Structure formats: structure tokens, C-alpha cells
Amino acid sequence: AAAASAAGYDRHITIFSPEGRLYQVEYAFKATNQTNINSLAVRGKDCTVVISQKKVPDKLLDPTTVSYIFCISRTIGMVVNGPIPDARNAALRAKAEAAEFRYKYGYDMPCDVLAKRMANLSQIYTQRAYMRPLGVILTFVSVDEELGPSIYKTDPAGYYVGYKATATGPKQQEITTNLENHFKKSKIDHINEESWEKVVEFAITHMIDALGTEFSKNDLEVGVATKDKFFTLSAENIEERLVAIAEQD
Amino acid sequence: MIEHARTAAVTHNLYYDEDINVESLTQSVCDLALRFGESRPFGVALLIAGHDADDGYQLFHAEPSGTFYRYNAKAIGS
Amino acid sequence: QVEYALESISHAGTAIGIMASDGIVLAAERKVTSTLLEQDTSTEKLYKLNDKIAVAVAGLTADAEILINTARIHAQNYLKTYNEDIPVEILVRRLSDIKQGYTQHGGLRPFGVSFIYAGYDDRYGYQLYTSNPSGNYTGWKAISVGANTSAAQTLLQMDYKDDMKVDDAIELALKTLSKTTDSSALTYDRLEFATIRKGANDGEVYQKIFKPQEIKDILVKTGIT
Amino acid sequence: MFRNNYDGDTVTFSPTGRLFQVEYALEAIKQGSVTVGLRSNTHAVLVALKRNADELSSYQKKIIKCDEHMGLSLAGLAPDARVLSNYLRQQCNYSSLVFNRKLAVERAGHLLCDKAQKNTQSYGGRPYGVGLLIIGYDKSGAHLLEFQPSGNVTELYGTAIGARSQGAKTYLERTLDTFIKIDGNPDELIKAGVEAISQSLRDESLTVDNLSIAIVGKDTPFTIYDGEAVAKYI
Amino acid sequence: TGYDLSNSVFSPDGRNFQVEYAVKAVENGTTSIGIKCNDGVVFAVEKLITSKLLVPQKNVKIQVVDRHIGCVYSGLIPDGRHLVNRGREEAASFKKLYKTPIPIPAFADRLGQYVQAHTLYNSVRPFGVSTIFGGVDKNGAHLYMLEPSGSYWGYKGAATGKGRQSAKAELEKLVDHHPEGLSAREAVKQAAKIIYLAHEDNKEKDFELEISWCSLSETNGLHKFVKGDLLQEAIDFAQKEIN
Amino acid sequence: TTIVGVKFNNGVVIAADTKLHRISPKIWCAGAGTAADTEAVTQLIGSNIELHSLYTSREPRVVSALQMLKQHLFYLIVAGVDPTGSHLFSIHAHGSTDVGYYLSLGSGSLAAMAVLESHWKQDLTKEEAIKLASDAIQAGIWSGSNVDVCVMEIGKDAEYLRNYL
Amino acid sequence: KLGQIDYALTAVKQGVTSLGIKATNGVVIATEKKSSSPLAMSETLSKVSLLTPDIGAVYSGMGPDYRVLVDKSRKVAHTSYKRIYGEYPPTKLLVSEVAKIMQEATQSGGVRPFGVSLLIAGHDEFNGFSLYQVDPSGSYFPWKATAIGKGSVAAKTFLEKRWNDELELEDAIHIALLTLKESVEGEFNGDTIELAIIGDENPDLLGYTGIPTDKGPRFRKLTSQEINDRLEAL
After folding, report:
1. Catalytic site includes residue F1
2. Based on C-alpha coordinates, what's the Rg of chain G?
3. DSSP category for residue C11
4. Which of E116, E133, E139, E144 to mutate to test the interface with A (most CBs of A within 10 A)?
5. Where is the cross-link described as Glycyl lysine isopeptide (Lys-Gly) (interchain with G-Cter in ubiquitin) (chain C)?
6. Nearest neighbour of G14 by CB, restricted to A20, A128, A176
7. CATH number, domain with residue G67
8. Does A113 contact F56 at a Cβ distance shorter than 8 Å?
9. Spatial CA neighbour of C5 closest among C103, C104, C79, C84
10. Chain G residues closer than 8 Å to C41 by CB
11. Which residues on adjacent β-strands are paired with residue C131?
12. Closest E-chain CA to A82
């Protein structure tokens, strides 16, 4: 696991091509699509919501272990779009960064300083020829006390920005266009509902309407950001949201 | 190799109050060639000759490989 | 194994040093540059080392300014150490040895610069020298480095006289530059100019690194417009 | 006419899951002279055929003492056998002063596997090119181990390694029920080993200096015999 | 075209071909499996007998970590030994610091992180092993399979090595026909059946069946080997079934 | 010795005899030691807290100033206004911290705390708090001219007055 | 002849346009802020940065490289001058340290140049107002006006037409907004433009009052409303 001298060509190590491209970083973007999972994140009035597809085709898996939503600290969570080993690496890093910050600076790591820190780490992996980019997009969510409901997304180039809503995965462009046309209609920067029960409900509706497939309890995953608790829904709680979509319409 | 062998001889002399064995000095110049100073070869073939009270009069071929043999007689070079 | 660094300086504008019987005369020419690149700066051609020594440069300012600052530091340290200011020979040898090291040591690169060190001290009087990337240096009656070196040295050789005054060395530097100019006229904004002379009247070394108006005044003495 | 693209480094995998550079390091074991090891319940024996460069040359050392209760042999490479054997001596001394135990020969095996596998995983380095037969005695009885430069070690009743070893190995496999029952008699276990090594000498002949023997177990420290001491086993 | 020669590199697809090639090494290994029971885990393996000269009681394919984690692997033999040593010292580290046996999920993540690190740098290669490991802790039975990429999941039953296709297909029948979950005694018998069924693709070599188990009722949640009459009863079950 | 601090109804005050320990635009100190304070810790924390502000893009919290003091002193008073609101703290060589509606420290302390206890109000308006801080340090006096003061209101840039009495 | 730095310059020549203009009484630095998605909150990333209260920067090229550069440039402006001299640097000192940071990457093997060119603008007591371009090479140049990125050849032609020694800061802002208007990729408004000045001091932005010595930031990022007010005339 030490650094050492070794050789490479302009697309085997992160080096500028003749046209200024970094192929090793653009190929790490293609690694994010590998799991074939779509995810969606949206802001409520006093919460922020993250919905993931769940794929467990293999009947021999314990479905309880297959999980792309991660608890970084009491206030903050993330969804990973990419291979599970890189996701567990990024999660262990983000947990350690948040714990070290709460120790030094004396308040819980804001969601704008965790995305920045993780994006700065990814820039060091985009200029290093001895270490690769991670094949992951990280979407961080919390209900900050400085900016309120917050979505921040970080990618293998170490770019990051804050989001009104976002979708990540193989079919994300349709989810994104259907979200763009929702905010073009409602003219808010959030989903105008006062309870996380109605936002996790609206996000599941948009995920179904975009992907063209219904979800069993087990085909979906959920995150519910509230002040001093990020948490993930158990399948019987997600059943409430799914049963509240069938009864509504 | 020679100035390593010289520094190896004087350090053994002041440690044991006794002369270095010719095998042990031959071993030391071979270890230098395995270290490359500090699977590469290093330097040149040596004939190493000496007397010690244990193994008498001895002649060794020390090789660029960092390995050696004792000979009763040995020719090297042209 | 350095000759490419000597090729580098050959492009870098031109500097003329001329030694009189009673002074020295540095002149140098700024390369014409972009309208918006700032001229009012520290990166020029005619710099200084102490109140008795001046330099003109060919080659890149980024390699020049490190050596100029090392020379200023070493000259300040010598004046602080002995209360008499550094000899010109010891400055150029000290700067010739730093430059030699970075040429022979393969962990470093040869400095792509060549300075004309003019000066005065009482151990040898007025001293004009050139140093180049190889780390060798030579004493001169007149010298030039950089662009038009060859053409300028012929005009220097056929007009230079050992007995000449500083005022004749002003004329000869200006007339050499106006003979060998890349622009088909010479102007005060392209020209940097300095002298080292024997005081106002008493024994002191008097430098002038000339301001743009004083340059205009010597150009209109010398018949360059 | 062919150009293997996947054997340049110890860190490349073949498209078929092969570490060719580690296989070529196993091919280096078949460059050194034959060694045999065998064991019963009370004793374990090494025997080795020592080469020389010329008739004026001394004989190359094949057998090394790592501690009073264990030691090894070295076919393939001679200098790669001293890096491992020096480390095995250090780890035995360390076990005496830190734990007041003799190093277990299984524990010694894991420590060699550990050291060897690291070279197999890192750039710029090369897998060892030496095969060790380790013999020892400890509280579990007499033991023989075959170490392979990939980082693997095997518990055996007997084996042979070096050039033309299949002869001795085939004799041991045929003689197994006999040499494993040689208990309380060390000389017959040595003779069974010297007859096994005689099956690998294709037309060649043992001599006092061309033969080296070692034994450990029960009341006997690890001892090496070579020169006149092997005269009763020729 | 050179993306497959060194370990850090992504191919144009965004996959690491040196880890694709490391799992080809796993696919050449001896078949091994695990079964998650109602209160424990059973592990089984085909131990190929290479010669009469191997000392029969001291070559053991199943590996013990702490006292509650059982382990088995397929592929490179030095790499499996190294992950088992990392495992033993990683468990002994947690036992020294927290005075309590390591959670199987926490143990699994410490290995997953270790193996994933060997996919980051071109100064190293991946591990050429898949590890099946598992045990009993405060939360009951856990079974894990960890692969060359550092990828791991929890399983109901897991299979790796040369016979993995046939073993996966049989393990699916166990899960379909026993949807409540198997007893440890039946899982032992049923694991023997799956190793014999995996060996019929490889009948040219002799093998020894090796079984171990870790069950809260049968073994008090300590990992132990299946020895004597129960092993022979499970052999006789596998032998009547393979007819 | 110089210190009185008042956690008043819309902000906070600290007064001293002629401190200048501006940790940040909204965070201030006073202290006895004076040579380890000013230069050393208050210059050195002042760098780390401006870097923290530029890095995190948010105002620096007083709890961050406290954490950095406690770990960079490894007898000050600290006051300031966060997005959280107003704070007053004191720090101890034991490695501890406390919070009070008001405080004083050093040789004048018990006399000043009597003047504080005689006049505190939970609805204390800022001129009344400034007056209480002034007059409790005036009661602590028989360095320089008698009073200077720092005031940090919830909405506003801090006001320091180079003298007040 | 090309190497890794000519490729880092091509990353800069592909990047979003930015510019600097120096006036009689201050400096402008300005750029377009381009959004990856209309769901992205464009206030949450800053294109123009405060280094010290009297030095500011803008880039062109790879945005993540510039963010790590400015974090290091701020740390450099602190550990160097605030923590030993007690005061902030001249623009020349901080530009040399930024160029030292950029040269260290182009030098070390197993690192690549920073894929950004920087315009650094600021004030000093001795030098007055100044503007410098810092390239991936770790080289620095002083400028009267300049542009970097895609639009730079047309922008520098308009800056050559329009610069003179007598411009006021308010008219340099009009020239800057005219120069950004022609190169604009997205929409042109106070939410897509980012613009700062170093000019007169702003005692309100000191954020405290009393101590007569401190005067507050020379540096000021314009709010989007102030930009839109100027765009009504532009």
C-alpha cells in the first residue's frame, strides 16, 4: 500500500492528453454506472429526502446487507452511485473526516465542508499517477442549521456543487428532465410539503413515473434528513409510503 | 569494495581485539554487492588471500553476483 | 555539455559595456513586447549589486533575479563584515562559482543568463567583466552579450581606443546600438543606460542608472534624433 | 516468434489468473543440485548433494542451522537461501528471548510464507528463487516442511527438490510405509535418505565431500555431517 | 491495449482488468462453500490429495479466526494465508482494545477495506482469492463472501472455486425447499452432498471432504471441526445421494 | 484583574482598564498573562480562525475559538456573537470552561461580582450592560486610563471604544 | 517539442473566460459562472476568491485544481506573513508563492501540472494596485489588462483597443462587463456573472469598529443586485 516508481501512458495514469483531457478520470465516471442503480434526492420544507433503487436478483444474498445509503454522522448521510468497495472506502473516509472535525472545531461537520473535503481528496486522486480515482459519485444530504435543507454531490474529478434536487444513475437524464419540468411549474426551490411522510411519498412517485416500473417494498431504499437525525427507512416504514401512494390515486 | 573491506577489517579489530577471519571478510564484500553498496551485479571479480588461526591459508574468488568460492588455485582475467 | 544554454541567451536583447580611462558605461536594449504587458516593474536589464557595481543582463529575468539577489545579499554581508565594500573581482568570481555548480551538478539546470558586471574598487580600479552559463568569466575593455553580439563587437573593435573618456564611451555605446539596432530607429523607452564615474569632483564612486529624460538628453547630444 | 505480455513483473496477472514471474521462480529451484528430506516419529533427516565450480573448488553449502531444534536446505539459489535463513535465525533468537520458547516449526513456516508473499505482491521486487526443505523437532514431534517461493509451505513425510528430484521423490513415495516406521534408530533413516538421493544421481556417485547429511529429533540436537563424517553412509 | 497490464488502471469501460484477472485465479481453486443455519454456519471444501507424502492430519483447508469466525478460500494459496493472518491479527486487535469478540460485520469491513486498498495503487497487485467466512456473535449467525475487488455481501449460502456453478445451483435448491432455514445437523449432511456433487466434474483426482461448523446450540457459538461419526454419517449421506 | 463581562439581552460586553484581544471581527478576549496573550495565542488562533472562516464560508463560532484556546494553551475570558447567538466563556489551566450571565477575574473580582450581583437584569439593555461593566471595573480601581469596552450586538459589527469612562 | 505543460496550457485554453483590468484607482477581476445543471445552486461554488483582504484571484481551466490551489494559497498567505511578520503580503510576494506551488507540481514526477491559469489582483503600500497572470508552468507576468480561456484572443483585442492609463475603476467595470458579454456561453445576468474589485477600502466590511488602525477589505465581490444595476445601463 506504499507509493513507488512505476511507468505509464497518458490514459493509464492521470496525465494530460495532447488535448488536455484526463482519461483515467473520465473512465472513473463510467465506473459509476456499473451497479445499474438509479437514485433521487429532493428537498422538503424542513427535511431532505434520498431514494435509491435496490437490486438483489441473487436469491442467495441476504438483502439486508445490500445498501447504498450511508450514515456519516447524526446530522448527515449519503448515497453512493458506484461499486460497493469504493463506496465503503468513501463512507469510512467521510465518517473519519466528520469525527475529526467535531473534535477540533466543536460543532457538527456542516454538509458544505464535508462535500468540499471529499472533493479535495478526489482532486488529489486526479493528479496522482500512483493512486486511482474512485469509481463513485457521492450525494450528501442534511437539514443544515446554517443553510437549511441541503443536497451536495461530489464526483471522481473532485467537482462538487449544491443541488435543488438531483438524480444519479444509468437513467438519471429522464428523472432530471421530469424534475426540471416540476420546478419550471411550481417555481419553488423545494417540494412544498411540511412532513417527511409527504416528500418521501412525492419522490417515490417521481421515481416510478420516470423509470416506468412499480416498486415492491424491497425494490426501493429511503433516507430522511431531519435536524439532529439522518435515518434510513426500514421496509415496513417504506411500505407506509408505498401504501400511501396507492390509496391516494 | 576495497575501502569497504578496509573499513570492515578495522571495525572487527577494535571489537574483538583479534584479526578478522578471511571467510568473514569475503562474506562482507559479497554482502556489499547484494546491497548494491546501499539481482543487480556490483563491481568486479576479486581474489582474496589471507591467513587466520582457524582455517589456515585461504584463497577466495569473490564475484560480482555477491557470491563466492574457496579455491586451492584460481585464475581470473585474460 | 551546456552549449544549448549559451544558445538560449543569443536571442535575449543586447547589452554593451565600455570602459573608459575614467569610468565604465553600461547600455542595454529592452525587447519590444505586447501593448498590455506591464513595463513599470523590477524585471529590467540594467540592475545593481552595490553603490560601486552594476549589471546588465541577457537571458531570462527569472534566472537573473535569483543571482542578482544573491549578489546583493553577499555584497551587503561583505560590507557588514569588513566595513569596506566588496571588490568587483570577488563579486564576479563568487557569482561565477555559484553558476558553475548548477552546470556541473546533474540534479540542477544551467542558469540561462549572462551578466556584464561593471564596477570600481581600488585594488584594480574600474573593472568590466562578462560571465556566461558555463561559469567562466573574462575581463574586457569593451564587451557585449545577447542579440547582435558579432556585429556589435566588430564596431566596438574598430572604434574603441584605450585612452578614451567616459563621454566617448557614452557616444560609442549609443552609436554602436544605433548601428546594430533591430528597430530602424532607436528610442529612450527601449534603452536602459548607466554609468560609474569618479564622484562629483571628490574621490567617491558615483553611479547613475539614468532616468528616461536623462536618456533623451544624451540621445539629443549624440545626434540620434 | 512468441512474446509473453504478462510475465514482465511480479505484480501482473495473466488473463488466465497466472503469476508467471512466480512460476519462473519455481523453475529456478530445478537449477540447483538435489536435496532430500524424510521423517519418522522420532527423527527427521536432510541429505544433500553439494556441487563445486572446478576440481580445485570447495563445495557449495546446502544445509544451514537456524536453531538447536531446526534448520533447512537450499536447492535453486544460494544467496536467496541466506536472506531467508538469516531471518529464520533472527525469529528463533527472538522467540527464545521474548517468549522463553523454541520456535514451533509450523510457526517458522508461517513466518517464511509471510516474508515470501510480500515480494510476490510489490513492484520492483522479485519472488524468492529458492526452495527450502525445513526440518525440526518441537512438542508436536518431528517435522518436515517444503517451502515454495510463491509463499506456500507444506507438511510432508518426505520430499526431494533440485535438478532430477523426481527419482528420489518416486522412491520415497514407494518406500513411505517403511521409512516412517524407522523409530529409535537414526542411522537407518539416514540410509533410507541416502538411498533415495542415490535414485536421482543418474550414473553419478556419492563421495565424502559430495554428500551432506543432517538430523534432528528426540535427544539429538540439529547436527550436520559432511566430509569424513558421511563416510559410513556412502 | 495496455489497460490490463497494471493495477490502478480503469479500462475504457471503467473496470479494473487486473481484478477481473485475479478472479480467474479464484476460479482455478478448490471448491468451497458455506451454509447459514438457524443458529450458525457450516463450511465445507474439496481437499485435493496431491500425493501420499502429505502428512494427512496437518494439511487443513478450513481456517480458524479468533474462536467464533470460520474461514475458507479458493485461488492463490499464499494470498489466502495472508488474508487469514490479517484476519487473525485484526480480530486479536479488537479483542485486546474492546475486551469483547469482534462483530462479524465489523470484521468483514476491516478485510473489505484491506482488500480494496490493494486495488488503488499500481505499486501492488490485487489478492488472487475469494474468502468465505462467517460466525456467530451478539446478533446471531452471519455468512460472508469477500472477493478480489474487496466486494463483500452477507449470504444465505456461498460458493467459490472450480465447482461453484454446480454448488450455486444446489444451494438455490436448499434455500427454495427449506425457506424457514436449515438445522446445523442437516446443513452438515447437505454440505457434504454439495461437495460430492461438485467433485463429479473433477473425478480424476482423489479428495478428502473437510467440514466445520459454528452453531449456538451444537457448538456454543465456538467454531469446531466435524470429526468422527457425524463426518462419516455425512459422507454416507453424500455417497447414497451421488448414486 | 481588568475583567468584567456581561451577557446582556441582545449581545455581550467585556470591559477592562486601558482588552484589545480581537480574535475575530465578532470574537474578543481579555486576560491577565498579556505576553502569552496578544502575540502568541491570540495572533496564532486568529490566523487559524480566519482560515477556518475562508475554508468553511461561514462565520467562526465562539465554541471553535474556545476549542482552539483550550488546545493551544495546552485564565482568559472569551466573548462573541455567532449565527448561534451571543456567548461569554472563561477558560482554566485545569483544562476546563464555564458559562455565566456575567463574570469577573483576578484581584478585583469579588468586589466587581458584588457590583454585578447588585445590578444584573435578564432584560438588561446594552447601555445598562456597558454601564454595569464600566462601573464594576471602576469599583475594581482606586496600567492607564480607567475604562475601555467591547460590545457585540446580535445584528451588528462589534463596537470597541478606546475609552468609555 | 510539446510536453506535459503545453497540455496543461491547452486545458487552460479550453476553460471558461476570465479577465483582469487595472485602472487609475483600482483593479477588476471578472468571469462567467457556468452551471452543470439548472438544478445546481450556482451560489454554492465561488469562481472569484479572497486570498487576503487586499488580494483576490480568478482562474481559467480545471475548477477543482483552482479550489485546492486557493486553499493552499490562503494557507501560504497565513503561515508565511501573518504568523511571523504580523501583516499580509504585497501581491508580488503572494504571486511568487503561488508560482512556487505551481512549479513544484510540474517538477515532481508522478504529479501533473495544475490545469489552471490564474489572474491575481491586489493592493500594496509601495507598489500600489497590481495585476499578475500565473500560468501552469509556475511563471508569472504583470499586466495592464489581460484575459485567459476560450474568449482570450478576442477579449485581449478588445482590451488592447480600450485600455488607457487614465481609466477609472467604474469605467474599467464597464469595459469588463462589455468583455464578458461578448464571450458569454450561457445567459448574461447577475447570477451567471462573477465580478470583484480591489479599490478603495470598505470600513463596513471590516465587520467591527473602534480600533482606528484597521481599515477593512480593499477586496470586494459585487452582489448580484449591484451587477444587475450596472447591467441595466451596459
Report:
1. yes
2. 17
3. T
4. E116
5. 80, 179, 211
6. A20
7. 3.60.20.10
8. yes
9. C103
10. 142
11. C137
12. E14
Q: Hey, what domains does chain A have and what are their CATH numbers? A: 8-248 (3.60.20.10)
Nearest-angstrom CA–CA distance, G234 and G231: 5
How near does any CA of chain G get to the CA of C43, in Å? 10
E126–D contact, CB cutoff 8 A: yes
Q: Report domain extents, chain D.
A: 4-234
With residues binned 3-state (H G I as helix, E B as strand, rest as coil), the percentages for chain B, rounded to 5, are 35, 25, 40
**Chain A residues close to G71, C-beta within 8 Å:** 120
D217/C50 Cα distance (integer angstroms): 86
Cell numbers placing G133:
497572470
Neighbours of C161 (CB within 10 A): 11
Q: Is D17 left (phi over 0), alpha (psi -120 to 50) or beta?
A: left
Query: Does residue F80 contact residue F59 with C-beta atoms inside 8 Å?
Result: no
Supply the range of the domain harboring residue G140. Answer: 1-233
Q: What CATH fold (topology level) applies to the domain C1-225?
A: Glutamine Phosphoribosylpyrophosphate, subunit 1, domain 1 (3.60.20)
CB contact under 8 Å between D17 and E59, yes or no, is no
- The residues spanned by each domain of chain C are 1-225
The three state secondary structure string of chain G is CCCHHHHHHHHHHHCCCEEEEEECCEEEEEEECCCCCCCEEHHHCCCEEEEECCEEEEEEECHHHHHHHHHHHHHHHHHHHHCCCCCCCCHHHHHHHHHHHHHHHHHCCCECCCCEEEEEEECCCCCCCEEEEEECCCEEEEECEEEECCCHHHHHHHHHHHCCCCCCHHHHHHHHHHHHHHHCCCCCCCCCEEEEEECCCCHHHHCEECCCCCCCCCEEECCHHHHHHHHCCC
User: In chain E, what are the domain boundaries?
Assistant: 1-243
D10, D19 contact by CB (below 8 A):
yes
CATH superfamily entry for domain E1-243: Aminohydrolase, N-terminal nucleophile (Ntn) domain (3.60.20.10)
Q: How far apart are CA E198 and CA E196, in angstroms?
A: 5
Q: Distance of CA A219 to CAs A51, A171, A201, A248, Å?
A: 11, 16, 15, 20
Could you say which DSSP state residue D57 is in?
A: B
Tell me if F25 and G75 make a contact (CB, 8 A cut-off). no
Q: Return the C-alpha cell found at D148.
A: 515454495
Size of interface A-F (CB pairs under 8 A): 25
Q: Is E36 helix (H, G, I), strand (E, B) or coil?
A: strand
Contact D117, E82 (CB under 8 A): yes
Nearest C-alpha neighbor of E105 from the set A220, A64, A229, A232: A64
Closest CA to G11 of G99, G106, G107, G114: G114
Q: Exposure of G137 by Cβ count < 10 A (0-12 exposed, 13-18 middle, 19+ buried)? A: middle
Task: Kindly provide the resolution of this structure in angstroms, with one decimal.
Answer: 2.8
Q: Cα–Cα distance between E223 and E221 in angstroms, integer? A: 7
Instruction: Quote the CATH superfamily of domain D4-234.
Output: Aminohydrolase, N-terminal nucleophile (Ntn) domain (3.60.20.10)
Contact predicate E46/E30, CB 8 Å: yes
What residue type is assigned to position G122 of the chain?
G
CATH number, domain F1-165 = 3.60.20.10
The three cell numbers locating residue E117? 486498498
Crossing angle between the packed helical segments F41-56 and F62-72, to the nearest 10 degrees: 140
Q: Find which of C33, C36, C37 to mutate to test the G interface (most G CBs within 10 Å of its CB).
A: C36
| C-alpha cell at position E112 | 473489505
| Partner A contacted by F83 (CB < 8 A) | yes
Nearest CA in chain A to E16: A31
